[model samples]
Target: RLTPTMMLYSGRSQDGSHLLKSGRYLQQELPVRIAHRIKGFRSLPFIIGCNPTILHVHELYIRAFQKLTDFPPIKDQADEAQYCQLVRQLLDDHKDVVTLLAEGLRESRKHIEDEKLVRYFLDKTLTSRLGIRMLATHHLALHEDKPDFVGIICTRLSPKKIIEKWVDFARRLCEHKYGNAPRVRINGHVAARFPFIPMPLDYILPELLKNAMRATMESHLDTPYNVPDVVITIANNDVDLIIRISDRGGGIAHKDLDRVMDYHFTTAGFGFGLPTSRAYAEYLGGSLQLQSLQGIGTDVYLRLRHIDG
Candidate 1:
């Protein structure tokens, strides 16, 4: 199996030969990945496995695997283009698989008595999903006409721009949900840029920012003091770019911190964001860490590798 580190190293160049090699690798790799997930779905308890949405996903995977395995070897640009189209079609078709799985699991929750087992299964399934999509999407992006992208990996990804964009989105979301939203203060290396995939950043930053905004607003709902601003710090070392998001919204309780990261664990909305974001982070050889002090606030640190350009 190809590790994220290997993939990163392999993606360092975007020459025609490299693109062709990537296409050939994915042609073999994707089917194996899909087959593994299909086996996972099959191994679930019969009642849960038989759920219509679950069955539908399993069928989709089966068909996708067949399509991929049946495809002819990619020999040149024309063949690679067609392969890319097939992969793109598969990506679109499976776009809603996460939501579908959520529905399936929820519907099947009564049949299974072990909640931990369910969480474990879903976690593995989602992580695999992220990896497969990342490979396929990155390959497709590499063939696109854009100059700034080496596939989905952005050559000059601006952390400040991404952060500001998500902050604006989170702020609007907060304003709509609550009458008020906390101010966001960005500091440290505001001009830093690096080689990274924008996909995970797109997922992780929005999740952390939204959580910070929500916590900040809810914590100060009837308070006399003005809500504290959500603070974001960005920096980098020789090997990795790091981002820290701190919020003065009342921190998670000592006992709840563990559960907060659990898949589907939630106090207000569906609890998929944090874990999903972490999966994206980890899929690319990075991590998402959380630190909280009860009655104080919370700190979330996101670290991502600087893919060599």
Candidate 2:
């Protein structure tokens, strides 16, 4: 039999052959994502529905609008143009300031230990981590089904190590907090980018993991919010990692399936998790994706690329 190292490094060849063997079987699976290397695995989330929306600080926009209304209503053509320009400037300047502040904070935290303080600098004064980490956790306690519930928390982890940890954590979490509930099939996968000069799985992994967890817990006819059975897949092992989490619950969603990633919208718990999920994804060089059907279950995909790449 071949050694473990051979299997790990033996990705697909130029002809798209040599699929990686699954943990469940000795045979290779087709369409196995190929990469030049797997320095470390990232996240691979699969959730159906949820696309990003252009997020605007509406309250701020309203304030800008009000500033215009308070001024004398423009009567002449020049006056109207001036009024419009005034409002436009205010909005533009405000957005620029926010963008700079956000970028500055991110850059500062890139090599700092006190990343939490970066939020303070950005004027983000939330009590809980409404960021990606918080968003990932919100799904942990939520159950999509009316009564049945299963929770998956996507955390920063190693695909191989994480899977082992999940199984260990599940036993403890169930016996302690869940008490007499059905056993949760604590599961996870490594969604990772391929090739790297520096580290690959460092940051992007967490966001993918978090999105995967939330998608896994979403409700479906076959896979209700509470009863979650899921799979997470990656697109490439080299350029980037795209995680596709499939549910054993029916198949996929149809319509509303595409909007799961929008900000202010949510699949489980608060109406803000999905947006926060994107923020987390953005924090890394990655994104969240979805696939679904009307009667079948859904699949959530978290795609990530290394920032340096």
Candidate 3:
């Protein structure tokens, strides 16, 4: 894809004319496939899951384009060749970016309705997130350059302790506003330990639990006196760490489950929480599975791959 583009740019001089043209080309062409203007999905499921992936990539390439356009002007004739070469080199470095984006879209479209949308939402959001983290890492290395900075940072994470703090925090917030919140029950081997990035896990844990609490509270609204508490069950499988958050919210409608991870599809309009949480889970070599049964409740399964295993 880039070969011909660079070939043409090679024929032109570096006097900022071709540099400006190449920048324009990247901004316009790279994102064209994903841009809504080129094509859009009208199906609700696609709109919720598949469409956002394309839209995000489109926006990312646009940002990349803007950055390219902002490059310093070439005034020195002697530096013209070097500047041109640098422009091509920098753009070349990012070739993998678009390929990843395209692969995301392709894989997303290939799955069944619910699986297709849900996993794609989880996967692509992580792709976008990892890109941002990578950029931050590069900036950090540029400035800090510590010898061991590139190594993985691991920590001991406790699910029980994390849930305890979050439940208390959620209770406070809910009571302050609605004067109530659902109770949470911990079960299974809550003491099981794992080596992982605690912060990301912390972020994911609360979001799922909070959603469960909210669901349980809403489900029992008519019977406020007989409110049911959400359940947190910690267990281990052959794969990795497993944490399941279940709530008796009467479950989501079959049609609505697909939209759960869609952008801005939440009933509470809570920030984009589930998709982002799923993204973090996947980035850490884990997976999130959501199962819901009508009149029964919703269960969230989080599986994290053992780093050393």
Candidate 4:
């Protein structure tokens, strides 16, 4: 309650430039602080055992906000370039916060078997990281002279259209890689129904569709691998927008479901997959869920609340 409002203020500041510079540090530093919790550290069996650790994370972020508040504004282009280099350093030294938190949380599972508590710690901490990035991103967008500047404007996005384009793109990518491309079918209420940042959806859909396409292509590989169509369904209601991606690929094993959602956990060697998409979903006030049947297929459900704020 109070924390979210404080978090909101942490994102909003008078000097956009200061926010951009300091928020970049805040985004990168929190994971380093979280990493300290894992090196030979021990957590208790109960949820309360995590209180000290949680507060430590809060303290780390609060200090970051204080740094933001005290940060000097960019006086000249030289100063701007210097600050830009700092943000670039932060990005370069990136740590997988989600995986670090997840692995650390797994340690406490022996005593505290509560899944919700594990998620609470991970989700809240990650949301704080999300807040920092959003603050920096928004400030940079509002003032494009900065290095963190990435144009993010609210616009109408046609899900069907995005799907259509990305499906073709994915097929091309697949064709280039796998020597064959899969057919992609889009169906549903894909008309522009929500006003939000287009890039996130632009990013989320293709990653998911590509995954579906890969699965479909692989499932029928040994047999007659033809008609490789990955079906995507998009729908928008007054309150929520949902995208469903279904593939007739041989489904995942039960044991692999949890692992797939974890950060940097991949069978394909490159790890950036569900976790990144999940972050994109959560950044948009939404969620991503996956359902798989061992031999049947896999379904990915992406739901975003219409937070047209």
Give the candidate number with the greatest lDDT. 1
Model 3 Cα lDDT, one tens digit per residue, 9-56: 322343445444544443344333233212223332554445566656
Task: Show pairs that collide, candidate 3.
Answer: none
| lDDT (C-alpha, whole model) for all candidates | 0.83, 0.35, 0.57, 0.59
Could you report the Cα RMSD, in angstroms, for every candidate shown? 2.8, 22.7, 12.0, 7.3
Looking at model 4, which ten-residue stretch has the lowest summed lDDT? 1-10
Show model 2 residue runs off by greater than 4 Å.
1-157, 163-228, 234-236, 250-255, 266-268, 307-309
Off by over 4 Å in 3: 1-126, 130-154, 223-226
**Candidate 2 lDDT, 161-237, residue by residue in tens:** 43334434433443353232123232433443223211223333333334434444333324332455444443555
TM-score of each: 0.89, 0.34, 0.55, 0.61
**Clashing residue pairs in candidate 1 (N, C-alpha, C atoms within 3 angstroms):** 141-151, 142-151
Q: What is the alpha-carbon lDDT for the whole of candidate 1?
A: 0.83
Tens-place lDDT digits, model 1, residues 1-309 = 234533632444545887888888888788888898988988898999989988999999999999999999999989998999899899999999988888787758678888777777777888888878888888887767687776776778888999999999988888888877888999999988776677778878888989988888888889524789999999977789999999998998887888887776788857878878787777677899999967979999999887653
Put the candidates in lDDT order, highest first.
1, 4, 3, 2
Worst 10 residues of 2 by lDDT: 36-45
Backbone clashes in model 4 = 0
Q: What is the number of residue pairs that collide in model 1?
A: 2
